[PDB]
Design a protein around this ligand. Structure first.
Ligand SMILES: OC[C@H]1O[C@@H](O[C@H]2[C@H](O)[C@@H](O)[C@H](O[C@H]3[C@H](O)[C@@H](O)[C@@H](O)O[C@@H]3CO)O[C@@H]2CO)[C@H](O)[C@@H](O)[C@@H]1O
Length: 348
């Protein structure tokens, strides 16, 4: 039966969120290019993370987060068209992990993540993609339909033109248009299940979850069956060279605060100031053995974001000193905060 649910607007729900944490490189890990039919365990552990436990989520809450984003890649667990049946064992594991969060009295965001092999924003793919989106979102929404307002569905992650010269610079006009259709389908698909899903808050991204003039001007918030339940998700690993470029500078100084203020103000001006709720569903700064700079960056990022009433969700991929992107914060195997000064900076 349905869990009793508070009917709150998106703004009201966002005002209950403090700061969030992503379970990164976990249920979002893909194996598509070498293992077509992974078991749930093969997927969850494919990218350097152990099997998730309740104790890990307990530690996230203890550290000061009250929200967990659970990115999930469904592609390697989805059957053939037209049913696109999701593997039952996978759906069961996703629910187990969601429950680690929900049963901790936390907010939880559940999405579809690395789907770009099929989630292609072109007119030629549009009808096929809308059909698959509806097929998979009906399955996810019905499994999770009984949950209360603490569970938020996010319809897509970073829809984009993979391999395009402007993949990460707004794509093209056609792609931005088609993404509006995909977000509209997602909203319609969830509302069609009724119950608590009729009044659940839902999150939708812009093109590549990017905030720029190009992606904002062409973005259309879906039409909804209920008022004030939609939130835009922007990922903002800013400033790029410091935070996300593995070859970029490791320095962040007083002089960089002004560019960060401008970047975050642009998110506010594009959405929150216009009465469109917005959340930074992923941010972070790579470990470059630069703790003083990351502490200064982190204190100011959260201070400025809060000053614009924008909640933030750290991207934690459990990676510290690898040759890849090291966005770890919680060392999941030791249950230790590896960068305590940075955690403290973001929690003040
Ligand atoms: O090392 C394990 C595995 O890592 C894969 O790269 C990951 C990054 O580690 C991860 O930080 C990144 O996270 C991105 C997130 O999924 C996006 O939503 C977006 O906001 O940007 C984040 C930061 O880049 O995802 C990638 C995967 O796309 C390697 O691809 C893989 O080869 C390797 O085994």
């Amino acid at each position: 039966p349905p869990t009793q649910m508070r009917d709150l607007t998106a703004s009201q729900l966002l005002d209950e969120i403090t700061i969030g944490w992503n379970l990164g490189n976990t249920l979002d890990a893909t194996t598509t290019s070498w293992l077509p039919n992974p078991t749930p365990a093969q997927s969850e552990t494919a990218w350097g993370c152990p099997m998730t436990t309740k104790a890990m989520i307990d530690k996230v809450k203890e550290g000061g987060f009250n929200t967990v984003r659970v990115p999930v890649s469904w592609i390697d667990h989805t059957g053939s068209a037209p049913e696109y049946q999701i593997d039952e064992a996978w759906m069961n594991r996703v629910q187990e992990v969601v429950n680690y969060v929900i049963d901790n009295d936390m907010y939880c965001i559940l999405n579809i993540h690395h789907e770009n092999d099929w989630l292609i924003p072109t007119n030629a793919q549009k009808d096929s993609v809308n059909a698959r989106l509806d097929a998979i979102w009906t399955q996810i929404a019905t499994r999770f339909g009984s949950y209360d307002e603490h569970l938020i569905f996010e319809g897509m992650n970073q829809p984009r033109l993979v391999g395009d010269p402007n993949e990460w610079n707004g794509g093209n006009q056609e792609a931005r248009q088609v993404i509006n259709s995909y977000n509209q389908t997602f909203v319609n698909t969830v509302r069609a299940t009724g119950g608590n899903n009729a009044i659940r808050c839902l999150m939708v991204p812009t093109y590549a979850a990017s905030c720029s003039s190009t992606t904002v001007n062409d973005f259309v918030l879906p039409t909804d069956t209920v008022a004030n339940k939609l939130i835009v998700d922007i990922h903002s690993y800013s400033p790029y060279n410091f935070a996300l470029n593995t070859s970029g500078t490791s320095s962040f100084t007083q002089s960089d605060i002004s560019q960060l203020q401008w970047t975050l103000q642009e998110i506010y001006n594009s959405f929150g100031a216009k009465g469109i709720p917005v959340i930074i569903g992923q941010f972070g700064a790579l470990n470059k053995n630069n703790i003083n700079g990351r502490v200064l960056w982190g204190e100011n990022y959260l201070r400025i974001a809060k000053s614009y009433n924008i909640r933030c969700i750290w991207w934690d991929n459990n990676a510290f000193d690898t040759s890849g992107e090291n966005f770890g914060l919680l060392n999941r195997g030791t249950l230790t905060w590896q960068y305590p000064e940075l955690l403290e900076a973001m929690m003040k």
